[PDB]
Amino acid sequence: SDCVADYAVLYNSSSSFSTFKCYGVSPTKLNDLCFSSVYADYFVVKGDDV
Amino acid sequence: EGCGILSNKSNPALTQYFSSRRGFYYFDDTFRSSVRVLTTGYFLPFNSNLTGYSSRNSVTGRLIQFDNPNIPFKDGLYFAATERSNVIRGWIFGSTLDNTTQSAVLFNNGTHIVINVCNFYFCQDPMLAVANGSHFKSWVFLNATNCTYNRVHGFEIDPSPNTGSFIHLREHVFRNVDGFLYVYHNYERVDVYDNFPQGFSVLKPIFKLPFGLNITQFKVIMTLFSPTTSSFNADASVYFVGHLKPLTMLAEFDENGTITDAVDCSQDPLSELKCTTKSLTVEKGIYQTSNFRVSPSTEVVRFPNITNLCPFGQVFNASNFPSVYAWERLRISDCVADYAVLYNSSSSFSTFKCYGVSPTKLNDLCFSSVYADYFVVKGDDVRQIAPAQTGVIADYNYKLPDDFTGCVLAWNTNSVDSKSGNNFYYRLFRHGKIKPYERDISNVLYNSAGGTCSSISQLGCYEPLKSYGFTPTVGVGYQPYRVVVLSFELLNAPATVCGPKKSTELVKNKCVNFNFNGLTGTGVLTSSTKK
Amino acid sequence: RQIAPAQTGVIADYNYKLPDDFTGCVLAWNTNSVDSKSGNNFYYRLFRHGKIKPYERDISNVLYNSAGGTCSSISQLGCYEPLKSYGFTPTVGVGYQPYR
Amino acid sequence: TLVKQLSSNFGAISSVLNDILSRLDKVEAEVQIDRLITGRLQSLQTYVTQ
Amino acid sequence: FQPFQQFGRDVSDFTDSVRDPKTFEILDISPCSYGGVSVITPGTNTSKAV
Numbered sequence A: 001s002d003c004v005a006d007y008a009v010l011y012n013s014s015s016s017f018s019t020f021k022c023y024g025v026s027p028t029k030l031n032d033l034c035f036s037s038v039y040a041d042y043f044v045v046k047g048d049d050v
Numbered sequence B: 001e002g003c004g005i006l007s008n009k010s011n012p013a014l015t016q017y018f019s020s021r022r023g024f025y026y027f028d029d030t031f032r033s034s035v036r037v038l039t040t041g042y043f044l045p046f047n048s049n050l051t052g053y054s055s056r057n058s059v060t061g062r063l064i065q066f067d068n069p070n071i072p073f074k075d076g077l078y079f080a081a082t083e084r085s086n087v088i089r090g091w092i093f094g095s096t097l098d099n100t101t102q103s104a105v106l107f108n109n110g111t112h113i114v115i116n117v118c119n120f121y122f123c124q125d126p127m128l129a130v131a132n133g134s135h136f137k138s139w140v141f142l143n144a145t146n147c148t149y150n151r152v153h154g155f156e157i158d159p160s161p162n163t164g165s166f167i168h169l170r171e172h173v174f175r176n177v178d179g180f181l182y183v184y185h186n187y188e189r190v191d192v193y194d195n196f197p198q199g200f201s202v203l204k205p206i207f208k209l210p211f212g213l214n215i216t217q218f219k220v221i222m223t224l225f226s227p228t229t230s231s232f233n234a235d236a237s238v239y240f241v242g243h244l245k246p247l248t249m250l251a252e253f254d255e256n257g258t259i260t261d262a263v264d265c266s267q268d269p270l271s272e273l274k275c276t277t278k279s280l281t282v283e284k285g286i287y288q289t290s291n292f293r294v295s296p297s298t299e300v301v302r303f304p305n306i307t308n309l310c311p312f313g314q315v316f317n318a319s320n321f322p323s324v325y326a327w328e329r330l331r332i333s334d335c336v337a338d339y340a341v342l343y344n345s346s347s348s349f350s351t352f353k354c355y356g357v358s359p360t361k362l363n364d365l366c367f368s369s370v371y372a373d374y375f376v377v378k379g380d381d382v383r384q385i386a387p388a389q390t391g392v393i394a395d396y397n398y399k400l401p402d403d404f405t406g407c408v409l410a411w412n413t414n415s416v417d418s419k420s421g422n423n424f425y426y427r428l429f430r431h432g433k434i435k436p437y438e439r440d441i442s443n444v445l446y447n448s449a450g451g452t453c454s455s456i457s458q459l460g461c462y463e464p465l466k467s468y469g470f471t472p473t474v475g476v477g478y479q480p481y482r483v484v485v486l487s488f489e490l491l492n493a494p495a496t497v498c499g500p501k502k503s504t505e506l507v508k509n510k511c512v513n514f515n516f517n518g519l520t521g522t523g524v525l526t527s528s529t530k531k
Numbered sequence C: 001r002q003i004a005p006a007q008t009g010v011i012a013d014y015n016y017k018l019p020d021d022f023t024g025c026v027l028a029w030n031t032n033s034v035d036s037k038s039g040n041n042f043y044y045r046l047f048r049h050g051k052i053k054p055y056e057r058d059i060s061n062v063l064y065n066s067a068g069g070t071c072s073s074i075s076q077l078g079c080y081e082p083l084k085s086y087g088f089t090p091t092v093g094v095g096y097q098p099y100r
Numbered sequence D: 001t002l003v004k005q006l007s008s009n010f011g012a013i014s015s016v017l018n019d020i021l022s023r024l025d026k027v028e029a030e031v032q033i034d035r036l037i038t039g040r041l042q043s044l045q046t047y048v049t050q
Numbered sequence E: 001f002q003p004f005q006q007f008g009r010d011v012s013d014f015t016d017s018v019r020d021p022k023t024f025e026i027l028d029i030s031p032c033s034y035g036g037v038s039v040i041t042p043g044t045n046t047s048k049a050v
């Protein structure tokens, strides 16, 4: 909460996403959207469980 | 099993008969009651031609009669037989009917029903012999190898020959779709000798056999008879063969779900009237009937005189593709787009996504102008080569329009451009996104919050290009992939690249199916005077 | 990825074809540690005259003659074997490793 | 005004059935043939109504 | 039913009969409220009973 979602700063890192699926919105139209509340869930899976 | 041979046989007389209303079957398994259904499929048309094959023989004066040729299996068969005693016992299905291709047999052994799909070495005259009213021998094939399917059902018939006027009529239809062979059955008692009986009959399904077989030919197994001796002689029998055609019929169901009668559409104007109103009884008056008397069967295709193979070798098996920020365009024209020649190469595509067209309909469609863009990406950046994507590549290196018509190709090349000539770069740190089908080969030194730092040692100024760290013994992803993007353009311009279809001869004043550079349709062709 | 309705390739045209409006499910998993050691029994069919029908197969090992037919020997010009062997062996890249 | 409604996309890629059927496989064909069928049926309904 | 029948359909094409898989008997399916119901009222400002 209370932050600016700039996804361009992740390009400078050494990790590249092999999966960037988005549901209900478009990945291109994320710099123009403005959300009310967001949540994050993180874990580790087998690799073919993705 | 020791197949017998025949020395001299008379030439078959292909006398043609008429089938009155026979050759109808249950076309599905949906249960119905008191409804009239209009259905389309492969059926035997009414008042069609049936070819007869006889087998009778006398003691002297005439040669033996055994008419068992390779009847084609085009789209289906109507098999009707009017034998007395039991002479015709089963059929042979296959493509070449030799032991280099798999073939199927479905015949009555005498004490069993034998179904095998093996590599059969058939003899010249497949038969089975009986003697003194008992099952003596079966002489169908000689060798059978390399097969799995085998079904045997217990059954029993009487092999003793009789005399009379062909009291039995047994009829079947055969069709194979999606790897299943369908067998239908009907029986009734008639009294005819050398003519096809008239009437209306409905066939009921008994078999659905799951073998995937390329079936194009057909043969009939018969029976020989002896007066308890070594010499064998034939008996009187005859069967009829008809071919199924694509047409529409109307079926009527009663309250028990059986078919009482059917109407073959497009036979006479009376049946066409019943075919549109969906009723068997028509009140008096004048009615507007639809079109059914049209059977476009001829295919005419016209393609230009382009004959050279199209250069897939210098665009796939090349050396030193450029990096993604400096991708190159190639115009491809006046060639034949044969995609089957890429199967011979050692490289296999891990991405074959097409957007504006279907991948299967690429040998039939033709294009006015095509282009090719090729570069090298990181390996997990391949999913960014698509319409409406975001990332480093989709924003700063290579952008596709959202109204993209074409195909995207990609394959892993780790053994060729990971050891030497590793000068692959991608552009980071750009002020603004890139437009579709545009590139910027510029090495200006990037400064955040306003440009022109003019020195690398200052605070906040960085190089724009970052090197791919391509090296062997890394994981999938961080491994080089070669990407080719093909862009299609289908206009009213003359065609330049057209694929491998053999053109046929032009035909006029007939309802045919045409194809003029991927412009398939239906109609007649007539000489014009337009400009 | 060629085991799907409306696909093109070596498998989808000459080896195994799924019909359109196919109802069912397709399964796949990587098996590199069980069949890669002196197997030498996995082949695929190249060089066929015409495409395959859905749910059909042809187990034939006749010589293939390009632009013609009825080839005699392998030394005859324009004659090739129809079947080509998968080169399955351990320590190869993903995409060349066997899948069931 | 009824014969000129045949030149309408109705949300499909083209107003010609031959362009759709020659460029797309059979599975993807119905989802765009249905739009043309519904639009032409609606035009016929309207014409019968007036 | 037929020996291999499992459910029966209507001319409006909805299931009105089924065969129980355990005990081979034929049941009937009808909607649990079919037929109209009308409520007669005076004005709501006038009275309350219906």
Ligand SMILES: *[C@@H]1O[C@H](CO)[C@@H](O[C@@H]2O[C@H](CO)[C@@H](O[C@@H]3O[C@H](CO)[C@@H](O)[C@H](O[C@H]4O[C@H](CO)[C@@H](O)[C@H](O)[C@@H]4O[C@H]4O[C@H](CO)[C@@H](O)[C@H](O)[C@@H]4O)[C@@H]3O)[C@H](O)[C@H]2NC(C)=O)[C@H](O)[C@H]1NC(C)=O
Pocket (backbone or CB within 6 Å): B431, B432, B433, B434, B435, B449, B450, B451
């Ligand atoms: C075709 O090529 C041309 C030129 O080759 C391209 O034109 C360039 O376009 C980019 C962006 O459109 C432009 O970059 C800006 O330049 C400004 C100078 O005119 C910079 O001042 C600016 O950066 C800061 O300034 C803005 C105003 O202050 C801020 O809004 C901006 O976010 C930056 O501010 C940073 O710093 C402050 C400091 O406090 C901070 O508050 C901010 O949050 C932020 O961190 C831009 O970089 C180039 O100058 C243009 N080039 C030229 C020669 O004019 C054109 O884009 C190309 N076309 C295509 C389609 O690619």
Ligand SMILES: *[C@@H]1O[C@H](CO)[C@@H](O[C@@H]2O[C@H](CO)[C@@H](O[C@@H]3O[C@H](CO)[C@@H](O)[C@H](O[C@H]4O[C@H](CO)[C@@H](O)[C@H](O)[C@@H]4O)[C@@H]3O)[C@H](O)[C@H]2NC(C)=O)[C@H](O)[C@H]1NC(C)=O
Pocket (backbone or CB within 6 Å): B095, B096, B101, B214, B215, B216, B502, C049, C050, C051, C052, C053, C066, C067, C068, C069
């Ligand atoms: C079921 O099996 C049968 C037989 O096993 C099989 O029939 C075969 O079909 C193929 C292709 O349809 C035939 O191969 C072609 O035959 C023609 C002669 O008719 C040749 O001319 C062809 O060679 C070249 O021809 C042109 C040059 O003149 C070229 O433009 C062309 O590209 C060819 O290179 C070609 O060999 C084959 O002859 C028949 N076999 C028999 C015995 O008829 C049928 O296709 C199988 N069914 C299915 C669905 O697979």
Ligand SMILES: C=CC1=C(C)/C(=C/c2[nH]c(/C=C3N=C(/C=C4\NC(=O)C(C)=C4C=C)C(C)=C\3CCC(=O)O)c(CCC(=O)O)c2C)NC1=O
Pocket (backbone or CB within 6 Å): B086, B087, B088, B089, B090, B091, B106, B107, B108, B113, B157, B158, B170, B183, B185, B206
């Ligand atoms: C080989 C294929 C073959 C088929 C498809 C076949 C089917 C078949 N044969 C039947 C009867 C019969 N089958 C035959 C004989 C034949 N009728 C034939 O289709 C052929 C080719 C013969 C060979 C002589 C006879 C004589 C009967 C009488 C059975 C009875 O008394 O009910 C019947 C009706 C009774 C039943 O369901 O068992 C069917 C469905 N029988 C076969 O033998």
Ligand SMILES: *[C@@H]1O[C@H](CO)[C@@H](O[C@@H]2O[C@H](CO)[C@@H](O)[C@H](O)[C@H]2NC(C)=O)[C@H](O)[C@H]1NC(C)=O
Pocket (backbone or CB within 6 Å): B098, B099, B121, B143
């Ligand atoms: C497969 O078919 C071939 C030829 O059709 C068979 O080869 C013939 O076998 C007969 C045995 O009766 C020999 O007399 C011939 O000389 C052979 N050659 C030819 C050209 O006819 C072969 O036996 C069959 N069976 C197999 C290979 O198991």
Ligand SMILES: *[C@@H]1O[C@H](CO)[C@@H](O)[C@H](O)[C@H]1NC(C)=O
Pocket (backbone or CB within 6 Å): A012, B448, B462
């Ligand atoms: C990017 O990453 C580098 C280290 O790799 C770091 O020094 C730098 O501050 C980061 N940010 C920018 C804007 O360059």
Ligand SMILES: *[C@@H]1O[C@H](CO)[C@@H](O)[C@H](O)[C@H]1NC(C)=O
Pocket (backbone or CB within 6 Å): B007, B008
């Ligand atoms: C019997 O066969 C031989 C050899 O094929 C032939 O010459 C002869 O004419 C045949 N007999 C008759 C009556 O046709």
Ligand SMILES: *[C@@H]1O[C@H](CO)[C@@H](O)[C@H](O)[C@H]1NC(C)=O
Pocket (backbone or CB within 6 Å): B016, B017, B049
């Ligand atoms: C059918 O048979 C008749 C004679 O019985 C013949 O005149 C006709 O040409 C045959 N073919 C067709 C298509 O009617």
Ligand SMILES: *[C@@H]1O[C@H](CO)[C@@H](O)[C@H](O)[C@H]1NC(C)=O
Pocket (backbone or CB within 6 Å): B109, B110, B111, B112, B114, B135, B136, B137, B138, B152
């Ligand atoms: C076929 O019939 C013969 C006797 O005519 C019998 O010996 C044989 O076992 C039968 N075939 C099968 C598969 O049972």
Ligand SMILES: *[C@@H]1O[C@H](CO)[C@@H](O)[C@H](O)[C@H]1NC(C)=O
Pocket (backbone or CB within 6 Å): B001, B002, B142, B143
């Ligand atoms: C074919 O069958 C015969 C018996 O009739 C047998 O002697 C021969 O070995 C068989 N052929 C093969 C290749 O096994």
Ligand SMILES: *[C@@H]1O[C@H](CO)[C@@H](O)[C@H](O)[C@H]1NC(C)=O
Pocket (backbone or CB within 6 Å): B145, B146, B147, C059
């Ligand atoms: C076919 O038979 C031959 C020997 O006759 C054998 O070598 C081969 O493996 C068999 N192929 C199949 C698919 O059964």
Ligand SMILES: *[C@@H]1O[C@H](CO)[C@@H](O)[C@H](O)[C@H]1NC(C)=O
Pocket (backbone or CB within 6 Å): B254, B256
């Ligand atoms: C229909 O089935 C019933 C019940 O088996 C039977 O009595 C009747 O004869 C059949 N046929 C007709 C035309 O009702």
Ligand SMILES: *[C@@H]1O[C@H](CO)[C@@H](O)[C@H](O)[C@H]1NC(C)=O
Pocket (backbone or CB within 6 Å): B316, B317, B318, B345, B346, B347, B416
């Ligand atoms: C190009 O083809 C040759 C043989 O024709 C092969 O040795 C080489 O590896 C290929 N290069 C590629 C696929 O990059």
Ligand SMILES: *[C@@H]1O[C@H](CO)[C@@H](O)[C@H](O)[C@H]1NC(C)=O
Pocket (backbone or CB within 6 Å): B344, C066, C080
């Ligand atoms: C396929 O590739 C081989 C070498 O791998 C080559 O000899 C042959 O000419 C190519 N073309 C055909 C049609 O076999």
Ligand SMILES: *[C@@H]1O[C@H](CO)[C@@H](O)[C@H](O)[C@H]1NC(C)=O
Pocket (backbone or CB within 6 Å): E021, E022, E023
């Ligand atoms: C199914 O199992 C139940 C449980 O005992 C039994 O009552 C019923 O008769 C069975 N139905 C069969 C065997 O068709």
Ligand SMILES: *[C@@H]1O[C@H](CO)[C@@H](O)[C@H](O)[C@H]1NC(C)=O
Pocket (backbone or CB within 6 Å): E045, E046
């Ligand atoms: C109910 O009717 C009376 C009589 O006209 C009226 O005075 C009253 O306002 C009405 N009630 C409401 C809620 O309007």
